[PDB]
Amino acid sequence: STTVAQILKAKPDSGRTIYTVTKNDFVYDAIKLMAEKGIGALLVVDGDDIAGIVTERDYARKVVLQERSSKATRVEEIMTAKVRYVEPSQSTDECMALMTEHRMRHLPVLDGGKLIGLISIGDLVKSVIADQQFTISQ
Amino acid sequence: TTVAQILKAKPDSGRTIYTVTKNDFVYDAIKLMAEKGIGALLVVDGDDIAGIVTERDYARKVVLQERSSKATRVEEIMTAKVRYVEPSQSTDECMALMTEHRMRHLPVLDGGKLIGLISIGDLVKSVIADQQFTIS
Ligand SMILES: NC(=O)c1ccc[n+]([C@@H]2O[C@H](COP(=O)([O-])OP(=O)(O)OC[C@H]3O[C@@H](n4cnc5c(N)ncnc54)[C@H](O)[C@@H]3O)[C@@H](O)[C@H]2O)c1
Ligand SMILES: NC(=O)c1ccc[n+]([C@@H]2O[C@H](COP(=O)([O-])OP(=O)(O)OC[C@H]3O[C@@H](n4cnc5c(N)ncnc54)[C@H](O)[C@@H]3O)[C@@H](O)[C@H]2O)c1
Ligand SMILES: Nc1ncnc2c1ncn2[C@@H]1O[C@H](COP(=O)(O)O)[C@@H](O)[C@H]1O
Ligand SMILES: Nc1ncnc2c1ncn2[C@@H]1O[C@H](COP(=O)(O)O)[C@@H](O)[C@H]1O
């Protein structure tokens, strides 16, 4: 088994950086920040406690299709509150099952109740093939 | 495991491809993605593959550019240079492509004929679909 710890150590710097917004932030500001960092999710924090999680999938489904403006809508209105998480001990296979079964591409990592990072379906796919050999022609 | 097997694994053997035209409005693309529970649409120019548009394009190229989805065409935000695979190819190859090129969707062509579409989630499922897990 390859672990969540190992996935984070591979991440740049060294998975320690979690990009974040508060519940009161405008959705528009969430979307601008995602764009600035090249990411598709933000952990929603209200002063150190995990409030929820908001992603590009949330923005595509719950704003303009609901007659809302990202500028006049707050993150809380579209985020998922019941956040599923993993611990650094868990295997990538377990993580992939969770993502598949619950239809989510992001998993915060809590260690003893401390948020230590965040992993995504992309980090998991990379670990599956990262050491395999390919050709440009293949 | 092959792309063909990934397609076979899907409910209608992956025969359905949810599609839009280059002239359609982004809002109609977005509406349709919601309607069908998906994150991408193949963009057709009346029977030829013109591009691909995903929830990521929508997140990046519309309101952040002062545009409205009712007032913007799919062509404006789509990716015109589409990468694809054929059924012969292995899931590892598809995973590498998605990782290296930062895309989560691959149309599947067979002899220049579109047969279906696979996503990063189809690949991840194949990796663990046979594996045993407990709730605990
Ligand atoms: N070449 C690579 O190193 C690499 C790594 C990861 C993903 N990818 C690919 O790029 C695309 C990335 O999308 P994804 O589907 O994994 O989702 P994503 O775009 O949300 O994730 C991209 C990277 O940013 C990180 N990230 C996302 N949200 C974060 C947050 N709030 N705080 C801190 N870090 C965060 C992820 O852990 C991941 O490493 C996919 O096509 C995937 O295959 C490539
Ligand atoms: N339980 C399952 O069987 C299952 C299967 C696939 C994905 N997932 C999960 O659900 C989420 C789905 O996201 P995703 O990131 O793979 O992207 P997605 O939301 O675009 O894909 C969802 C499913 O719809 C299909 N699809 C998407 N666009 C299509 C189009 N234009 N035409 C035809 N089919 C299309 C995909 O191939 C995939 O099977 C992820 O968390 C993933 O892990 C679960
Ligand atoms: N760790 C998580 N726990 C619970 N829900 C999540 C998590 N990550 C994402 N989601 C939600 O699941 C949906 C898809 O997210 P994603 O596939 O990560 O874009 C969105 O409605 C998200 O808010
Ligand atoms: N098969 C593909 N070929 C080329 N570009 C793609 C492909 N799939 C998605 N993209 C683009 O890559 C970015 C991320 O897409 P996705 O991860 O599939 O949401 C978006 O700008 C898409 O338009």
Numbering used by the authors:
A (entry chain B): 2 to 139
B (entry chain A): 3 to 138
What does the article say, verbatim?
Here we report a functional and structural genomics effort that applied saturation-level transposon mutagenesis and next generation sequencing (Tn-seq) to identify essential genes in B. thailandensis, followed by high-throughput structure determination. We used an “ortholog rescue” approach to maximize structural coverage of these gene families, which are likely to be essential not only in B. thailandensis, but also in related, but more virulent, Burkholderia species, such as B. pseudomallei. Using only seven Burkholderia species to select orthologs of essential genes, we solved structures for 49/406 essential gene families, and for 56 total Burkholderia protein targets (including seven ortholog replicates). Of these 56 targets, 25 satisfied criteria for being a potential antimicrobial drug target.
One strategy that has been employed to improve success rates is to “rescue” such proteins by adding orthologs from related species to the pipeline, based on the assumptions that many of these will have slightly different physical properties that may improve their solubility or crystallization, and that close orthologs will have structures sufficiently similar to the original target to be useful as surrogates in drug design. By using an ortholog rescue strategy for insoluble or difficult to crystallize targets, we increased our structural coverage of B. thailandensis essential genes from 31/406 (7.6%) to 49/406 (12.1%).
